[PDB]
């Protein structure tokens, strides 16, 4: 149940912050010093600024460099997250995949949903289990995902460890 | 480390699908059935045809009431999310606090940052750090947020527990 680094990445819901401890809550001692993730007073940094840093929780990283939302984030400039603009990938942005395991639809946008994940779904976290592997041509998965022993892409122990064909598995 | 039930709200990063068994990863396997949160493949109901009960991983509650992100969600229609339209709010819209602990800045729009939660801040996650309670003028917190002891807004046992003024005192 624990969040930040005490949690692997993890984070905390409805925008609440991690404290530097590694637990859930709002308040001074959550959002103030420490803070990993959530609606910390000190906003993470992101993009070019940050080396490619993207933020966490979904937040837009403005052009500056810091994450939040509303109009100056999510507006012109936004550097990642939900931006206000389409965002484009696949064939026709160059391969270019979407960020945060986002689906590339069919369109070639960004997103998340039956829309972009589905049919046609090029790249990301799509709903769409395409075959990988020898029982599948020698297909080789889309974001550098574990094609697991059993011919399907995923993140995780099955996919990942003992039987991963083709992918960022460890061994 | 585990997230959904087996968390307490916990939600994976990049978007990492939580499994009905509280684990993190992508794949048939987490992002299949009994997702609890994430990238789901079996999107997630909002707003109005839902209760209202908000989209976790911060993600658009489109008009249809289906959690994601992209131009349909996010979109026109949306009920909830980082829409790419400005939530209102405060002393202008008729008092309303923002959607997922945002700031309510002094013009009254939704957000997250200096901009909205620095100064001039209605309500959320307000960095503004006024006191509450006995303290000074006796008042009280905005989102019924805790007051603690030491008269500070926030949730969280410190806050709740005991010597807690107002708000959800946990006790
Ligand atoms: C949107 C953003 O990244 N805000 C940062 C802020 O960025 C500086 C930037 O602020 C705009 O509002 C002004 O219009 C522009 O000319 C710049 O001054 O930088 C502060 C810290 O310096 C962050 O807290 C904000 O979140
Ligand atoms: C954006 C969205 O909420 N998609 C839902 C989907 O609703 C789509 C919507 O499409 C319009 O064109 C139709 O007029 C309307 O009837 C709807 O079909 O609903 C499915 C399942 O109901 C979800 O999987 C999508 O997430």
């Given at each position: 149940?624990?969040?930040?680094?005490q949690g692997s990445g993890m984070e905390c819901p409805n925008n609440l912050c991690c404290s530097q401890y590694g637990?859930?809550?709002?308040?001074?001692?959550?959002?103030?010093?420490?803070?990993?993730?959530?609606?910390?007073?000190?906003?993470?940094?992101?993009?070019?600024?940050?080396?490619?840093?993207?933020?966490?929780?979904?937040?837009?990283?403005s052009q500056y460099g810091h994450c939040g939302?509303?109009?100056?984030?999510?507006?012109?400039?936004?550097q990642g997250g939900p931006c206000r603009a389409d965002i484009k990938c696949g064939s026709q942005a160059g391969g270019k995949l979407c960020p945060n395991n986002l689906c590339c639809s069919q369109w070639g946008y960004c997103g998340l949903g039956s829309e972009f994940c589905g049919e046609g779904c090029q790249n990301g976290?799509?709903?769409?289990?395409?075959?990988?592997?020898?029982d599948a041509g020698?297909?080789?998965?889309?974001?550098?995902?574990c094609c697991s022993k059993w011919g399907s892409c995923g993140i995780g122990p099955?996919?990942?460890?003992?039987?991963?064909?083709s992918g960022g598995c460890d061994g």
């Amino acid at each position: 149940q624990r969040c930040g680094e005490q949690g692997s990445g993890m984070e905390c819901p409805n925008n609440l912050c991690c404290s530097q401890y590694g637990y859930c809550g709002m308040g001074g001692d959550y959002c103030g010093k420490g803070c990993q993730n959530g609606a910390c007073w000190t906003s993470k940094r992101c993009g070019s600024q940050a080396g490619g840093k993207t933020c966490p929780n979904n937040h837009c990283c403005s052009q500056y460099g810091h994450c939040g939302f509303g109009a100056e984030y999510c507006g012109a400039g936004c550097q990642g997250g939900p931006c206000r603009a389409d965002i484009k990938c696949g064939s026709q942005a160059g391969g270019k995949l979407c960020p945060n395991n986002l689906c590339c639809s069919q369109w070639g946008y960004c997103g998340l949903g039956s829309e972009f994940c589905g049919e046609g779904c090029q790249n990301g976290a799509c709903s769409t289990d395409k075959p990988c592997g020898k029982d599948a041509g020698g297909r080789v998965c889309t974001n550098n995902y574990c094609c697991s022993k059993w011919g399907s892409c995923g993140i995780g122990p099955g996919y990942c460890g003992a039987g991963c064909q083709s992918g960022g598995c460890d061994g």
